[PDB]
Structure formats: C-alpha cells, structure tokens
Symmetry: D2
Subunit: 492 residues, 4 copies
C-alpha cells in the first residue's frame, strides 16, 4: 500500500519531526580530531566506524579516545565500530613492479611460494593455497577489483593453472583477487583480525563489522575470537560474495546484524543483481528484527565535489525505502573534502525518504508473517505498535536493559519515535544502529532500581516532551518487563 500512500503525498508538505535512519561515518585524516568528530556528531553521525584495513592500533586508539571525548562534550552516546581487515586473496609481486596482461595471452597462476617475489606476465603467484582444488576449467579469476579477468583452462600441475587473459589490464604488486564461481574456504578471521579483535575487546568497542562472512559457522568463530569478555559486543556480518548471499538465512540467524557491502558484492556479481540482493538481505533482516546497514558507494562523488550526483541521492533514499536501519559513509568522511556537508546531506535525504515511506506497510507485512502462537514478547511488541496506529499515539517508551525489547519494537515500525530508557550506557550506544529509536540512560546505581518503573517511564516521557514528540493530551505507548507489559499513557 506504498502505492496508495504515494497518491496522497505532496513534496511541499513538511518533513517528519524525527529521522529514523542512522548514519555510520568512517573516521580518517579529514575527521579524526575532536573538533572534526564534534562537527560529524552535530551533522548526524550516530556511529564511528574504524576501518582496520589501515592504520595501526595507536592510530585507532586516537579515534577511540577522540570519539569518546567528542561525545562526552556534546553530552551524547556515540557507538564505536571495529570493521576488520578480514582474510584476503592477493597476487604476489612482479619483476619490475608491474605486469602487462593482454587479451588472448596465456599465463600461469601458481600457488608455489617460490614465485611470490618473482612474478611476471607469464607466471605469477596467488597466495590462496587452495586455489587449485576449488577452481574447475571454465571458472574465472578476477584480479585488481575485478578489472582483469582470467579464465581457467586446465591444471598445469597440482599448484599451477593455465589461464587465458580475457581482457587487457596492467596489474601491479599484491592486487586483490576474487573467485566469483567458487566457494572460498579461507578461515573466518585472519591472524591480524585476532590481534585486532582482542584490542577491540580491551578498548570496549560496541560492535564488530566482520569482513567477508561466508557461512553461519564463521560467525561463531568470530565470537570465539572475541573471547568471554567480548560476549556483549555485536557482530555485524559483512556480506560480500555469493556464498554470503546464498547462506544469508543461517548467517542472519547467528549474527547480530548485517552489512550489505554493495561495492564488494559488485566485484563478483552484476550490479543489477546486487540492487536486488540489497532488497532481499534488507527485508530478511527487517523480518529477523536485526539491524541492517546499507554500505559503500553511497554519496561517493561528494568525497571531492560539494554536491553528489542525482543518482547517488536516489540510491540513498532507496536504501531507506528498502528498509535499511543504517546508511554508511566511507571515504566521504574518512578522507573527503566535505565530511560535515556529506553527513548533513545524507540526513536530509533520509528524512525526505522517510516522510514519504508508509511505515504501516512494514508493520502489517511483518505482522502477517508471524507464526501463531506467537511468544509473549512478540505479541506484546506487535500489539504495542498496533496500539500506536489505533490510538495515533505520538511516541513509544520502551524500558530495555540489553536493548532486546527496543529492537523488537523497532522491528514493527511504528509511525512515531521510540524512546528507549535503559540502565546500560552500552545499550544506548548499541541501539545507534537500530532505526527509529533514541536512548536515555538511567543510572540505577545512582538513582535506584526503580522497581515500580515510574522514574524510568517519566524519564522517557520527559525526553519525548523535550523533543516536541508529545505534549499534554497526547498518547504515549509504554512497554516494559524482556517485555510483557504495556500501558497507554495520557501525557500530562
């Protein structure tokens, strides 16, 4: 009924008084300082992503410290995400630093280490040791962000494949390689990830964006890598090839959330198919009640120009229409010229798309898929959201300690803000990747367990009033405990 809803809109009408979608910003040279982080917060950042593909621990420690200091000064809670380098397949080095590959030529790719330092156009190293048992004649090998394509012809021997060069491209040392038709069986985490995951645990990071996740079992290996002290850290799986797409259900089941990495998927999969995989993965997460992030190539052209292209604008709005909880900036904020303006524009686009989006369609499609009998939690949250639509309540207040009930309510897509009142700061930070929720910390050790829930409910209603969401005479729907209890409150 989005179609029926479009009929009634006018683009000269006011936008909503709140933005539900959440903006993740990658921190780098343009943005690491406390003042630049403050600008990013004020522009609309909810999450600071650290790309551990680059920078040492010391560099990321400065990110960590500066985010906390910026957030403390503005009086907000900002989530910190550790995005891992992950396992990789790269070529070796070449004699003269470079290899000119020509359409029609035959070359040999080998996994023998002796060729690591001495590659040429005719024969060169690929560091993936299982390369030969996982490829068949006919498969393609992509190298250099998929620009050079080789076709496998035969096994020259146990370690060496004879390949045709399908297209001309010059490659330099240590380029990335992809196998679009094969199951890559590299481990879940690299040796470097293990070191980086431990550091992320020691430094209190909120979530991991775990690279190259291919199967459900690898999620548990990331979890083991985080150790017992890391058990509350969220694992968001980055879906980057066909195996991740194919195994999405069981991956979603084990993960705490999903990243749709469109540019990585796009190396292996036609761009038109990635548009469609983005729709599927996002709807499956919406149905699982798990946050989903739309990432890479979002307003890329605004890295160096003051304005993005019109197609990039439609990409960002369409991620919100698809159902994304979050939209993500990489080089635009890490190294770009206009970090503040890009985040501000991203927020505006999201806000505009949300004003057009019919939330009732998400609520109703999601509710119709529940199997009866529902459990108590599910019944209470979907009813509570139903009660919002039925009374036209203007806010929800959900008391949640771990954040579970807040995410379960957000899953059902009310058409008003959700204020989560929690007794854990780390819940305030982790809910920054859930659309449509804002969190209020209630310090139980300072103020009391509030067993009767009245102080926490008042803290929620007060926050909603300070934002203009509710006034005297409006309804607010309250949920508390996971969450088996609801009230419809008349606001004073």
């Amino acid at each position: 009924s989005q179609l029926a809803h479009n009929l009634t809109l006018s683009i000269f009408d006011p936008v909503a008084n709140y933005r539900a979608a959440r903006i993740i910003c990658t921190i780098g040279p343009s943005t690491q300082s406390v003042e630049a982080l403050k600008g990013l917060i004020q522009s609309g950042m909810s999450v600071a992503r650290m790309n551990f593909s680059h920078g040492s621990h010391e560099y990321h420690q400065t990110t960590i410290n500066n985010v906390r200091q910026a957030a403390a000064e503005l009086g907000v809670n900002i989530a910190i995400a550790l995005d891992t380098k992950g396992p990789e397949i790269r070529t070796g080095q070449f004699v003269g630093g470079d290899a000119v590959m020509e359409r029609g030529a035959t070359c040999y790719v080998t996994t023998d280490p002796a060729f690591a330092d001495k590659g040429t156009k005719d024969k060169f190293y690929i560091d993936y040791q299982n390369l030969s048992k996982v490829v068949r004649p006919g498969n393609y090998i992509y190298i250099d962000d998929g620009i050079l394509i080789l076709q496998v012809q035969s096994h020259e021997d146990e370690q060496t494949l004879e390949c045709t060069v399908t297209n001309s491209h010059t490659i330099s040392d240590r380029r990335g390689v992809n196998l679009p038709g094969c199951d890559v069986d590299l481990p879940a985490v690299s040796a470097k990830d293990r070191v980086d995951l431990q550091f992320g645990v020691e430094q209190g990071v909120d979530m991991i964006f775990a690279s190259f996740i291919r199967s459900a079992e690898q999620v548990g290996d990331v979890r083991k890598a985080l150790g017992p002290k890391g058990r509350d850290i969220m694992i968001i799986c980055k879906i980057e090839n066909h195996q991740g797409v194919q195994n999405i259900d069981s991956i979603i089941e084990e993960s705490d959330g999903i990243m749709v990495a469109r540019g990585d998927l796009g190396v292996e999969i036609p761009a038109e198919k990635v548009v469609v995989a983005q729709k599927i993965l996002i709807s499956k997460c919406n149905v699982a009640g798990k946050p989903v992030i739309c990432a890479t190539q979002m307003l890329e052209s605004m890295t160096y120009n003051p304005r993005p292209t019109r197609a990039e604008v439609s990409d960002v709005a369409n991620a919100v229409f698809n159902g994304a909880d979050c939209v993500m900036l990489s080089g635009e904020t890490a190294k770009g010229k206009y970090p503040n303006e890009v985040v501000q524009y991203m927020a505006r686009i999201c806000l505009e798309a949300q004003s057009a989006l019919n939330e009732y369609v998400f609520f109703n499609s999601i509710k119709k898929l529940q199997h009866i009998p529902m459990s108590a939690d599910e019944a209470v949250c979907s009813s509570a959201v139903n009660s919002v639509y039925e009374t036209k309540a203007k806010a929800m207040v959900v008391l949640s300690n771990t954040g579970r009930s807040a995410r379960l309510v957000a899953k059902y897509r009310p058409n008003c803000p959700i204020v989560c009142v929690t007794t854990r700061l780390q819940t305030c930070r982790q809910l920054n990747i859930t659309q449509g929720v804002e969190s209020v910390f209630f310090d139980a050790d300072k103020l009391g367990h509030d067993e009767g829930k009245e102080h926490r409910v008042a803290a929620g209603v007060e926050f909603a009033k300070s934002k203009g969401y509710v006034q005297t005479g409006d309804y607010c729907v309250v949920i508390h405990a996971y969450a088996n209890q609801t009230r419809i409150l008349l606001v004073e």
Copy 2:
C-alpha cells in the same frame, strides 16, 4: 468464516470447559424456597428474576431473602432482577363478565368512565384515554394476546370508536388490548412501577428489567423513578413492540442493556420478522458492548413435559449463535414441574452451541467497526483479546471495580474464560448478565487496598487454576488500571 469454522467441527469432540452464556430464571411458587433456589443455582441459574406483574412486596421480599440465603450457602453471588409490571390498557368489566364477539357484528369501545362496570357484546370499556386520538380510521384493535382483532372504522364520537369485529372471539374481564400500527403513548412507568422501583432500591436489587420501553426518553423516566440511591442499578429495557424496535439505537445508547421479548413483539409483528428483529437487536448490543437477553417462549413446553421440542432446542442454540449474552426462563421455572431439568438442559444446549460458535468472527467483526483513532480503553481491551488469539492464551484476568472494563473485554469475545477480579460484590452479581465472565470477589476491607494489584492478579490466576482453565506454562492475559495496562503472564 463461521462457514469455514463449521467445516472443522465434529459433534463427537468434547465440549468447551466453560459455558459463556448466562441463564436467567423467573422465581415463583415452584422455586421460591431456599432448597429449590439451591437446585436452580447448581443447575445453572446466574440471575433470579422477580416478575412484579404478580405477588406482593412481601412475597418478593421472601424471594430476595431466600435467593441471598441459597447463594450464601453455596458461596456464589447471584444477581436479583426486578421485572416491572409496566403500563397497560385494561378493558373494564362486562355483562356477567362475558359477551361473545363474532364476525360482522358491530362493537363500540368507550373512553367514558361511567361504563367501567356496565359493558356488553355491543358497547364496552378501555382505560387508555388517548385511544381515540391515536387509533386512525381502519387500524386494528387486538384484545387478548392478539387473538381478538377489531377494526376501527370511524370515530363514533370524541370518546368512542365505531368497530367491525373482524373475527369470532369470546372475551372476558380486563384484557391485554393491543394497538399494533399505533404508537402507544402511555407513560414510561405506572404508579405501581414507581412504588415497586423504590422498593427495589430499598431492597438493593442489581437490575431492573423495565417493561415496554418504546423510546429513549422513557429510559430517563425509569432512572428518575430509581432516584439518587438507585444510580448504580442497571436498567435493561424490554423491547416489546414496533416502536422499541424502530427506536432501538437511541434506546440502547441510554440503557445498560436490552431484553428481546419475542412473545410480546410477536403480538403485532409476524413471527418471521421477530426472528430477524432478534438478530438485529442482539448484534446492535454486541457492538454497543451492552448485555442482551433472549426471553419468552424459550423452552416453554418443558413447563409440563419432561423434554422440550426439537424446534425449541434449536431456538435456544440459535439465540447463542446470534450472540445473546443471556437466555431466560419464565413459567418453566416459576411454576413448572421440572425446574432443575429445564435449567440443566438450557445450560447443556448453550454449551453445545458455544463449542460450535467461532468467537473470532465476533472479535473481528466488532474490531473492524471501531472508529480510528480509538480511545485508550477500547484500544487496550481489543488488543488484550487480540493477544489471547495470537498467543492462544487460556484465560484473561480483568481488574474491574464497577465491571465496566470486564464488559468491555467481553464485548470483543476472546475464546477463553474471562476472570474479573473486583472489590464490589454488586459488580460480581451485575456481571452475571455478561457472557464469558466469572467474578472473584476481593475483600479490600479484609485484605487491604492491593495498590500493587499483585494480590488481585494472583486471586484471578488462582481461580483460573482451580477451574482447570490454565496450568503451569499456559499464558494468561491480565488487564487493569479504567483499564489501560496489559500483561501477558506465563502461568507458574
């Protein structure tokens, strides 16, 4: 969707574990004694009806006292209803008390008082002074359960009517005269009624069944006759002629419920139209959320025979399928030979019908008629009944002091028992006219104010446990303060 539900039924499956419909019994000489009342209660009586058309205040006082004593000895709460004589048009006296009226033969009816004694087969008497100025040229005067018809030709004078006798009836003193195309404008209540109603209030009756209600304003007259001390007594309007049916919407709005008096309706409305009027009135009260009683000609042949006719049984079951809260016995218990057996048989027909009735169709049809936005009470009660269906809960517990919210929940027809926990014994008795509710009295003088609700909630739950409605690991939906809080509780 009753249709789809019918497909799945087997008459060899066991019946539901609770009976939702309520049985009202008229007390008379067969049934007035404490032992006979106890037999009525154990057989299924929830309400004792006093018919104030017969007997003295002292006689009704004894019914009151004995009902209270029988209920006390059984530990139950039984409602007491006062059914008013109401206004009437009595013919006067005749020659020796008789005449024979025949077809063709000319008759003259009088509004003049001197002819109160001296009547004939020619010219006689009627005490309704508005007779001539209401009855038009050609209308019908029924006199005696509608069995004698007379046709008003012309006004012989101001206080006389010139009449065809249109059939052969042999009548006798002081008759039920019936003016069917005629809007009878006798007042709401007679002098007897005003005196009887005051007695009712003095004696603490739970409800009035107010005879012959024709318009909404007449409901006000009953309420004023009940006065300041009668403000908590329910008024159930007895719909007995075409005007009450025409005016049904405004009558329901002013009243606390309706009795459909099929026999009386039938004096001037063809029987097949009364069957439909019954459907309309029941559905309008189901939507109003007010109790509705199906009365007269229920299991009549069981007054003197040990079993009813097959068409009588279907009448009672269809009353339940139509949506009645209550079915009522008149002579069958007041002066019949099988009072226990007729009540037990009524209870068994009700329970059989209920096991075939799809409550969900009721819930859904009613919910769909709700105006959006809903008020908080409406939204909370529909949602709680919705949650019963979604979680297949096995009981509801409703905290309700006045009974209002118990009735609001019952309106939506959950497919499990409702347990009202109440602090007023009069709410326990008054809810006896609401299908699908059992009330648990919580003695606040003797047990405290239970500000936390927890003692009342547990009393509710324990009652449900003692009846076998719920056991360990079942769900129960709990509602309370109007009613703006809901919980879905796992039974311990």
Copy 3:
C-alpha cells in the same frame, strides 16, 4: 460480516423480489389430486417427494401422473423425488400384540427366527442378524422411535443378549430399533428398494432421496441399483445416524447432494448435537457445490393447527441462515389439514430470512477456501459472481446443458437471481433443488443449436425482464461454454 449486516437492517423494509430457497412437499391424501398439486405449485412447491415407505407402485404412479399434469397445466417444471423405504431394523411380534417393559427388568433380545412370531416382555426377536457381533456390553438398544431404551449386559449366547430395561415403555409389534453406539452394517438398499428404484427409473424420476446412507461405498451401490438407464438421476443421500455424520466428507464426494434428516438423527443423537450437525453438513455441501436439504419436523404443528409455533418459524429461518438450498415438508402436506397455507407460510419465512441474509459472506468464505491454481470452471464462475457484486448487476444468465455450471455459479451465492437457460427439461427439473436459480428450457431440436449462444442469452435476459429482475440500463452477467466464458451485458 453477518453481524455488520444485521446492524443495517430494518424489518419494515421491503423483502427481496425473489425467493432463493426451494420447498420440497411430500405428496399424500391431502395433496395427490391434480387440483391439490396445482394449489401446492401455486403456493411455492418446486419438488414433489414420494415417500416409498408407504403406498404401492400404483399409488405412486398416480402421484407421478398427477404432478406432470398439474405442472403441464400451469406451464412449469416440477421435480419428482423418490424417497426410498431403505433397510430397517425392527423387532418381531409379541404374544397379545404388546409387551410391557419395566425399569429394572431383565429381558432377552434374540436374533433366532423361531421367536419372530412369539415375543414376550422377557424374550423377543430383533430382525438384524448381526445384532450380537456389532454390540458390546454397555451399548444401548433403542426401540420405538427411541422411547424404550435397553442396555446390553452380556451375551447370553451367540444369538441372544441379556439386557436391562432402563425405562418403562410399552411396545407393540414390529417396532423400529436403533443402535446409537454401533456401526450398522445392513446393505445400502433393501430388496424392496431395488424394485422401487427400477420403477423410478422406468417412470423418469429426477432424483432419489436414498435412506440411511452410512458410508461412501453405499452411494455407488444405490447407483448400481439404478442401472445404466438411471445414470442421470441424482442421488441425494439421507443422513440419519452417526456413521453418516462421521463419514460425511466421503459421502458428499460421491453423492449428488445431502438430506439432513433431523428427526431420524434425533433418535440416536441429542437434539442440541443435531442442531450442530445440521450446520456442519450444510456448510460442507455449500463448499462442495452440492444441494443440501433441511428435512423433517419443519412446521410439524401446522399439520392440524392453522398456525405453526414461533420456535418452528425460527427453525425454518435458521435453516436458510445456515445455508440450506431446500426446506422440506412431510406430513404437513402429505396428510395435513392446511397444505396450501403451510407451503405459503414456509415461502414467506424463507423470503424474510433471505432478505436479512448477507450473501456476500457466503461468496467470500467460499472463495477464500479455493486452492490456487483453481481450474478454469471454478475461476470463471467465482469471477462471474464477483463481477455481480462489483458492478451491482441485477441478474445472471448461465447457459448449462447438464446443470453443472448453474450449480457451480449458485455455489458462489450472488446477490441477484440466476436464470439458467438449458436445452434439457430434466435439467430444469433437477435445478429445483438448487437455491437461487430458475430455469428456462430452450428446445434445440425445434429452434437450432444456437452455436453463437445469442438466442439462449436473449431467452435468459427476456425471462429476467418478465420477472422484473432487470430493466433497460441494468447489468446482467452471462456465463456459458461446462463454463469458461463470461460477458457483462448492458440490458436494452
């Protein structure tokens, strides 16, 4: 949504311009003559039932001849039904013609033939030879329309059961017996049925009401009994005990329709359960698209009184509310005092109930149960009926040779008349047991095959105009071929 529909009705509104339900009348002494059949036709009979439990072939031949002659004179098509005697279990004879059975007494029921002529209260014959292998100790034996109840105690020997008499009742010779807890395994048809079925085939009867149908296999035995020349005769199965109820699905599947024989069911099954089995069997037939007849004890009291009881009126309306195609009169027309008036009253009751009945509920419940993909026939008829609701068309015209497409359209319950145009008179007669259809004979041998369907469609539209169903500017929905073709016609 019957409940929502009740809210909008008024009993002073005009009834529909057509009666959809069909009245079956049993012919006897009060009604066998041509003038009395003419009166019955004019009063509303569509079907003349012959009860072959009584009368010889010669008697029924007069019924057959007189129905045809009455129908020819009035210019209508009347269906003729042969209702079989069927297999029976009876007691033998008693010494002195009579046996006084007393609560508490022991008696012996035996299947040894030697006792056929010499029964007494202590020991007597029951002609069902498998009696002893089919009963267990604890079972009941009903005798004399279920008035006398025996309980089986033990097997006295291979042929004799020792029984307690549970209640006092005097029985006379050759009384009927029932076994409520046992599977009766008598053959489908008696020796007498076979002779009567052959006669019915020779005389061109339209349908058989086949007595005591217990399982699906017995329907095929009735069919074999009718022989190759009887293959177009409809078999309507009379459902009279628990086995028929239990096996209803597979019976419906093989039968051409169902009779719900409430009084026979009521011998074995509590009357409250029979109310419910009537609902189930009728809805299952509505879903199967097969006619269903509500029979026995319909307005029984109007056999000797000029008016029926109010409960009997509600029984007839409630059969139409349940979904019956037909309602049936037995002694009321066969031997009663008021045959014309009873049929007229039955028609009026049906008409009144139909005016209140929400046909859209039947259409929508039935449509939602179809499995997708539907076959072409089903899709065309349900769409055609949907198109009636959508355009508010005022009639349907369905060209059907065998009557199959007309019954498939009637199954979907349009809210307008259906005019079936058929090239077989016997289809005109057989459709008399399908609600909501009237048939027009088109003699193809006289007028042409009408391959372009225009003359048959005009014959339908003309009939609809002559009845007042449609006028200039109204829509009429036309279906033709079973039936894979639809048009929405503007009436000229």
Copy 4:
C-alpha cells in the same frame, strides 16, 4: 507484501521469460542511419524519440524514414515520438558575448528590447516580458542550468529588476533562465512548436512529448495545435517544474500519459524531493491507467564510458520498482559512443528488476482503489487479470483496436505477458509505451473482418506459442468485445 516477496527471491534463479518495461531512445548523429537503428531495435528500443530542440524538419524527416525502413526490415513496429522544444526564456547578447558575475556585485535585468544586443556584466537582457510582474521582491533568478543564481531585490522600474548576484558564475549568450518560486506563464506552445506539431501530424508521428506542461488547460493548447487530423496522436506531458507537479492530477486527467523529467525538475526542486515526486507521479499514472516515462539522467555516464556507475544502475531498477512503464535514453543514444550496449544494458537491468517485482501488489493496490460500483470495462479487465492469478495463466490475449483495453488490462499488472491483437498498425506502435504488452497486427483488409474473433484469438495464441509463453495445457485468459467478454482457454 513486496516485503514478503523479497524473502523468497534468489539472485541465482533465472530471469522472467519476457521484459515488461519499454525502452525509449533519442535518435541523433550516432544513431540516425538505418543500420544503427536496426542495432537499437535488436538491442531493445521500442520507441524512437526525435528531440525537436535541435535539427531541421529535413533532418527529422530522415529519422522518420530511416526508423520506418529499419523497423520494416526487422518486421516490427516501432513508435515515433516528437519531443517539442517548448517555450523558453533566453537571455540576449552581451559585450563580446561574455561578462563575469560575482558575489555582491549589482546586476540589472531588462524587459526593454533595445538592449537585445548591448548587454554587460552590469545590465543585460531577458525575453520573458512578464518577468518583472511575476518575480517578487527576494525571489531567485537562476540562469544556466541553475548554476548562476541572482536575487531579485526590488523593481528598479516597470521593465527592470534590481539584483544581488548571490554567487560567482561566468555566463554566455542566450541562456536557460529559471524562475523557481515563479509560476511561469509563457504560453503552452511556441510558434516553432505549432509549426513542428503540424509537421508531426503530416508525417504521422505516434505521439508527442510536450515540453514544460504546467497546467491542464495547456494540454488543450497542444491538442488544438495538433488539429482535427492529429486527434489520434497521444499527448505525453513532460513534467518539468513545481507547477506541473502541483497541478499533476488535472494534467494527468487531460493527457494520455506523463514523462517525469528528473533533470529539469531538479533545477528548482532539491534532488531528494525529485526522487519522491517521481514516486508520486508514477503511482498516480499507474492508478490513472496511463503510460508514465522515467526520463533524463538515466545511464548518462555510459554516453562516453563502456559501463555506468553502480548508482546509475540502481536508479534504473528503482524506476521499474516505482512502477514506470518506460525508461528513456537521451545523449546516451543520440550522440554516445556505446548506443547498442547502453540499450542492452538498460534492457538487462529492467528484466532483473522485474524478476524481483511482485506484480500482485500492484494488481491488489489498484483494484482496492476502485469505486464500487465499477463500470463493465473496469470490472471485466480487473477480473481477467484476477483470473490469471487464480489459474496461474501464462498469457493474456486482448483484442483491442484503439489500444484502450490493452492499456486497461496492463494497468492491473498481470504476472504474465499480454498479447494485444489489433487491426491498426498505429495501435501496435502506440502500445510500445505500455509495459507488459506485445502487439500482433491482424490485417483485416487482407484477412477479413473476423466477426467471430476466432482468427484474431488464434493469432494471439500462436504468437504467445512462438515466444514460448504458453504450450499445450497452459491456460490463457482472452479478453474482447470496449472489452466486455472474457474466456479462459486451455492451450492446445
């Protein structure tokens, strides 16, 4: 329910066997020759667009002739569209042709004609005489794709405006000046347009893409300029500014379809609001049952690069998800380097998106918006599409001379191909702007009038067979005469 459909998809399943969306290509010097046009057709072009902003009548005549010749050699019918230059506000001439405008610096714009030649950086010229009396104190004058902004301060005189230059732009001769808060009241069509439109009619173009439509009355002006001989030519209104968007309902009602000109909208509406305007306009046309085209900035970067950006691909796919009938290429085919490849890639994105799009949501959303009662045509076409879903039919055949009913069927979005069988070659070409229809020309001069429809029906069915849409035992839904007859045919 798009949401539920997303859950079931796999990007590794095969694509649909037909592409429903239609591809429009702008002809220019890369593409004008018969061979290049043939390459366009085989690559997926259904419509040749002539941009009458450039080139002479002789030049467009050659496009016309070559399109017809290329289509004839391939045996297909291709639509020809004339896109009008439309009215404009050109700045005049300058000093040497240039100036540099900077921030702060004062500028004076003139409506006086003597300054047509002699302009400066100070004071220059604009040919829109209503300039001063439309533009208010403080409004914006954009001049050059919106890149130069100027702010109107006050009226320096009657025919002059006193202006802040609010940025640094260095402009040049005869510019696209843009008055964004301004309701531009230039007439509907210029003199060039009236001359070009008459040429269009003489040359038998199928449709007009009418530039810069702002109001409904303006549609009349186009139609009058087309005159009596142009009455069958479709008018597609190009929506290019805020007024066309404000007035969208009445414009659609008067027009035969809409083009959403994103680039032009974007001059005065922020890009994120144009994304939403696109959603609104497409849905309003889907409900109107009129073709809607998504145009400008489609795969722009593919004008000179061998591949588009990833955000461009998503733009095209989302155009299809929004519901567009047609996507349009401008410079990409008019002067680009890869005209064949851009069309083939467009076709592949369209087909990918379609395989993910749930047509049923469209069908259902549209059906629900229909007013009851429906007219016969509406009811027949929705029902026929409903029958496709119910029987999982694999094709529709629609007989439609003018194309009206083909478009009415397409509106309801069956999930199978529609084959229109038509007697007019111009209906074959005009339906090229309606998604999901292929047209089969039935030559009535050469083949007869087919009064029985049977030859046209079989031509439809055979075409569907030759494309592999249906084989033996599939269903096909056939609709014909407006369209008031339907058949569900089993394929032989």
